Amino acid sequence: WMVMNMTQNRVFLRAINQFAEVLTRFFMDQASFELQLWNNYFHLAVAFLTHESLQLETFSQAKRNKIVKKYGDMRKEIGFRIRDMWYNLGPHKIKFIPSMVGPILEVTLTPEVELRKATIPIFFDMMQCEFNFSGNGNFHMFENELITKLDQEVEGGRGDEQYKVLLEKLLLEHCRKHKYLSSSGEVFALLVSSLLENLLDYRTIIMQDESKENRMSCTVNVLNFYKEKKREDIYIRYLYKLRDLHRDC
Amino acid sequence: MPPPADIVKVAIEWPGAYPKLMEIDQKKPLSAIIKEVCDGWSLANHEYFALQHADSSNFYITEKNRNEIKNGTILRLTTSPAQNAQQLHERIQSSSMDAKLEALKDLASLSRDVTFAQEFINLDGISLLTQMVESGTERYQKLQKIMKPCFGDMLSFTLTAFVELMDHGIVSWDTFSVAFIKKIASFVNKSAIDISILQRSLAILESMVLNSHDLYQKVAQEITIGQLIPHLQGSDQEIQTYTIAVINALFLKAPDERRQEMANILAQKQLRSIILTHVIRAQRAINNEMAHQLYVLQVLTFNLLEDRMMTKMDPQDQAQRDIIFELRRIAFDAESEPNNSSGSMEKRKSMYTRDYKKLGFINHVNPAMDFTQTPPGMLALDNMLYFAKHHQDAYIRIVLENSSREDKHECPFGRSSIELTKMLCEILKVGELPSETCNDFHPMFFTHDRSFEEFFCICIQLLNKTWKEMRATSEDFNKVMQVVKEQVMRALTTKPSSLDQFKSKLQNLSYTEILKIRQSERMNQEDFQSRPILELKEKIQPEILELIKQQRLNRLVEGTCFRKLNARRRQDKFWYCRLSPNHKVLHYGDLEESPQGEVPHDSLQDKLPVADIKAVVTGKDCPHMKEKGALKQNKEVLELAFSILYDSNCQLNFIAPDKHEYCIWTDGLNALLGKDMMSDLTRNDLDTLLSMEIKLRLLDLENIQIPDAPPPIPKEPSNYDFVYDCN
Amino acid sequence: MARWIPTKRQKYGVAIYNYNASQDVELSLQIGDTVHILEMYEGWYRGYTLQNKSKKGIFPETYIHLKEATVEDLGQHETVIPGELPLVQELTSTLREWAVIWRKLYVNNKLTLFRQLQQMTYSLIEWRSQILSGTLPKD
Incomplete structure (x- = not known):
């Protein structure tokens, strides 16, 4: 009953929208308390956002045509509401990091572009807020698990190349929008795109026939990434994978 | 700059002589052409020669039809037409009978000109012909029993000349005398005449009827119904057409009272029964002239109904009141007591209103207001009288049916009958002149002399049945009209023979299944061969064959259990040959007894260069079948031989379970070679896949006929100016 | 290719047969190549073909069968009987899905399923051709 599912998702969107509007009504700057529930x-917002997407409906163009004719894509307004709420949110984003890192990855790697175009500046905003928090030191503390979760997402099979290119264009724009820390952010993003x-x-x-040399070169590249970025977890696990492949060869 | 056309080539032949050429310009007057011809050929007496065409026409050159002159045509010279007329006149009263025969034969054959006919008649030809016919009445009697055939043939030729002269109308109307009619009557009265003479005489009679009216009365005074019926006994269709045409001529310009009289005579003689048993049951080559005969006889029956229905039934007639009283007595003996038959008029009016308020009539004081409009008028009264006479059971059922209609959708019998009569008159084109080209014929009109009434009864009964099934409303009058028109047209196109069989086949017919089966047959034939359809499927073949090859390769990747050669001494006959998932290498070799199938691993011969494979020989050219030692294979596996040849010294010979798997394998191997397929199953699959695709695509053209000729290319503006923005 | 007017009475652009290669944008169009035309000209029509909705193709009027009917078949009273032509258009969509069905049906051998599907779709197209014209009682 796909129609039942889509109706349910529509009313889920409505429920999330009314949640957002009541939160705006009575959870403003005075209500800096009890914000842990936003996590x-x-x-849940992203967990709802992560189904009934383009690749799900990719089997036949008729499904896409009918859904855009009757409802239109809802994940688009999910992202729009998320981004405007984050814009209106406030400077307490520091506590979001260890929680918000995971969820924003899936919307980062969306199959579409335009909503991703509108959503990318959230990374610029969170990076400048990370500098606000970590001026007394460095600010690896987002990028490390950012790369890790990127690592996990692509292992799940949602990576893309022209998406990077667009990422690089956007972050070049952001570095042009910023000051001396722009060099730091842009070299970080260079590492991000290269990995x-x-x-x-x-x-x-x-997925293609095994070659066993380009993959190994890529793995030593990721090893360079991890050793340069002061991270070891995925580093040790992927060198474990390297040892397994050696054994197999 | 087209080349000038003032110079043309034309050879003028002679009978028994070889041709001579000259340049002839037709724009100049024929006098100049004659002068130049005589000057070139050095011939005197230019007035004693003329020009005629030696083609199939065999006519002379006329100012109106000289355009047939084209370069490179046989043209032989003849004498001048004046000299031809003079010699014919001299030889008319000659002393040689063979000369007379040939001269009259030529005269009749070359009797297809008008102006030359004028010139010949200017020589008192008609007067001389009349004089020799009048004086020849007793002259040929002595030699009649000697040369009846030749004399009859000459008479036929002269009558043909007379007919064509009358068609051109060169002879005057008043010049006709009673001698011609008397001679034709004498010809008819003879009992030893041939079939052709009778046909010519009846043609003369019908021409006489078409000319005037009093001569029609004269011939009809000597016309009996008992002599034109034996003409029907003849199996020839032409004589039947002639007799029917003369019969129609009898109904052309006669008073309507005599029309009814002779119609009653035909009915009492039961002409339609013998017509059905004679011409309808014949399975010979039906002529379009007979179709015209059927159409004009249908028109005659329609006029015989109209001349009695064209008048308006006066509501003030007491006889009409008595007739409708008796009709409603014999119709409504379910609600009306029998005592009202001899009762007063108050109960008559009470029954009128109580029975017409259930039949959609508004007025209750003057019930006969609806009987002043024709068609049909009183034809409905005749139909209901016939219903009471023959269908009294159905009549009573219908009487008890409409009055019991509780669905608030009672059908007005009078209004529906008027609408159906109007539709029938429109579709049958009542009131128009007969067509000169259309040859539609309905053989069911000859089943009964009252055939149209039977057809209308069957139609209304079918309509009542269909309406009872549907229970129609007042919002689908257009739907009712269109469905009845379509069913009537479909029934007419079926060409029925008998009334009962026609009515049964009306119910036996499906829901336009003929159109569907015809479309399927046409599509199948176009798939076999067509100019504007067959090229469509063969034009677009990029995906069907490619995906067939992909399917074959997927079959190769999954693989199956194969068989080895001479595996009788501890050699396993189960093994596998799996294609790489990259589709470039083959994994095959010596394996064990594997009922499960292929085991994923590297085989003994894990490499097979597909670019070094030359071809795959199929049949008796496999080297492994050519051993003369001890490893000979069975003749049973002659259908199971195929070898992958490479290195010109090593052969990969494989064994198949049965035919279809070997066909799959050889199709896969050629696909590796990128060639055509060699599997009956593929051909079995090739037809349907294309058939399925085009069956999918034909829905856009459904309900729309596809033109055969290529559509033209209409002009387009040169500029790309967009009034409405693109995208 | 000038004088193009917006119009909504030509959405069902019925072809005839494989069009000539005189125009680069025009190809050997298939039978079911309905052109969703958004421009009106006296003797030509350029619109979006079903196979490629992103590519325009200029088509002659003599090559276009006049179909004023839209997807909504009651606003223009095109229906032979109300409430039937929506069924035929959803059936057309169904068969356009049947296209990708039999396209994916050959990746895996479904011989029993494939043959019974052949029989069912045969009866389907038979009944569609049967009810191409609605002239039967409502039952």
């Missing part, structure tokens, strides 16, 4: 709130295309090659060759 699970947006967790992402590394894993793109890994995924596009792990």
Whole structure:
């Protein structure tokens, strides 16, 4: 009963919208307390956002045509509401990080572009807020698990290359919009894009016939990434994978 | 700059002589052409030669039809037409009978000109012919029993000349005398005449009827119904057409009272029964002239109904009141007591209103207001009288049916009958002149002399049945009209023979199944061969064959259990040959007894260069079948041989379970070679896949006929100016 | 290719047969190539073909069968009987899905399913051709 499901998702969107509007009505700057529920709130928001998407309906164009004729895409307004709420949210984003890192990944790697175009500046805003928090030191504390979760997402099979290119264009724009820390952010993003295309090659060759040399070069590249970025977890696990492959070869 | 056309080539032949050429310009007057011809050929007496065409026409050159002159045509010279007329006149009263025969034969054959006919008649030809016919009445009697055939043939030729002269009307109307009619009557009265003479005489009679009216009365005074019926006994269709045409001529310009009289005579003689048993049951080559005969006889029956229905039934007639009283007595003996038959008029009016308020009549004081409009007028009264006479059971059922209609959708019998009569008159084109080209014929009009009434009864009964099934409303009058028109047209196109069989086949017919089966047959034939349809499927073949090859390759990747050669001494006969998931290498070799199938691993011969494979020989050219030692294979596997040849010294010979799997394998191998397929199953699949695709695509053209000729290319503006923005 | 007017009475652009290659944008159009035309000209029509909705193709009027009917078949009273032509158009959509069905039906051998599907779709197209014209009682 796909029609039942889509109606249910529409009313889920309506429920989330009224949640947002009541939160705006009586959870403003005075209500800096009891904000821990926003964590699970947006967790559920993304958990709802992560179904009934383009690749789900990709089997026949008729499904896409009929759904855009009757409802239109709802994940688009999910992202729009999320981004406007984050714009109106406030400077307490620091506590969001260890929680908000996971959810924003899926919307980061959306199959579409335009909503991703409108959504990318959230990364610029969170990076400048991360500098606000971490001026007394460095600010790896988002990028590390950002790369890790990117790592996990592409392992799930949702990586893309022209998406990177667009990412790089956007972050070049952001660095032009910023000051001396722009060099830091842009080299970080260079590492991000290079490792992402590394894993793109890994995924596009792990389905093709085994070659065992381009993958190994990519893996030593990720090793360089991890050792330069002061991270070890996925580093040790992927060198474990390297040892497994050696054993197999 | 087209080349000038003032110079043309034309050879003028002679009978028994070889041709001579000259340049002839037709724009100049014929006098100049004659002068130039005589000057070129050095011939005197230019007035004693003329020009005629030696083609199939065999006519002379006329100012109106000289355009047939084209370069490179046989043209032989003849003498001048004046000299031809003079010699014919001299030889008319000659001493040689063969000369007379040939001269009259030529005269009749070359009797297809008008102006030359004028010139010949200017020589008192008609007067001389009349004089020799009048004086020849007793002259040929002595030699009649000697040369009846030749004399009859000459008479036929002269009558043909007379007919064509009358058609051109060159002879005057008043010049006709009673001698011609008397001679034709004498010809008819003879009992030893041939079939052709009778046909010519009846043609003369019908021409006489078409000319005037009093001569029609004269011939009808000597016309009996008992002599034109034996003409029907003849199996020839032409004589039947002639007799029917003369019969129609009898109904052309006669008073309507005599029309009814002779119609009653035909009915009492039961002409339609013998017509049905003679011409309808014949399965010979039906002529379009007979179709015209059927159409004009249908028109005659329609006029015989109209001349009695064209008048308006006066509501003030007491006889009409008595007739409708008796009709409603014999119709409504369910609600009306029998005592009202001899009763007063108050109960008559009470029954009128109580029985017409259930039949959609508004006025209750003057019930006969609806009987002043024709068609049909009183035809409905005749139909209901016939219903009471023959269908009294159905009549009573219908009487008890409409009055019991509780669905608030009672059908007005009078209004529906008027509408149906109007539709029938419109579809049958009542009141128009007969067509000169259309040859539609309905053989069911000859089943009964009252055939139209039977047809209308069957139609109204079918309509009542269909309406009872549907229970129609007042909002689908257009639907009712269109469905009845379509069913009537479909019934007419079926060409029925008998009334009962026609009515049964009306119910036996499906819901336009003929159109569907015809469309399917046409599509199948176009698939076999067509100019504007067959090229469509063969034009677009990029995906069907490619995906067939993909399916074959997927069949190769999954693989199956194969068989080995000479595996009788501890050699396993189960093994696998799996294609790479990249579709470039083959994994095959010596394996074990595997009922499960293929085991995923590297085989003994894990490599097979597909670019080094030359071809796959199919049949008796496989080297492994050519051993003369001890490893000979069975003749039973002659259908199971195929070898992958490479290196010119090593052969990959494989064994198949049965035919279809080997066909699959050889199709896969050629697909690796990128060639055509060699499987009956593929051909079995090739037809349907294309058939399925075009069956899908034909829905856009459904209800729309596809033109055969290529549509033209209409002009387009040169500019790309967009009044409405693109995208 | 000038004088193009917006119009909504030509959505069902019925072809005839494989069109000539005189125009680069025009190809050997298939039988079911309904052109969703958004421009009106006296002797030509350029619109979006069903196979490629993103590519325009200029088509002659003599190559276009006049179909004023829209997807809504009651506003213009095109229906032979009300409430039937929506069924035929949803059936057309169903068969356009049947296209991708039999396209994906050959990836895996479904011989029993494939043959019974052949029989069912045969009866389907038979009944569609049967009810191409609505002239039967409502039952």
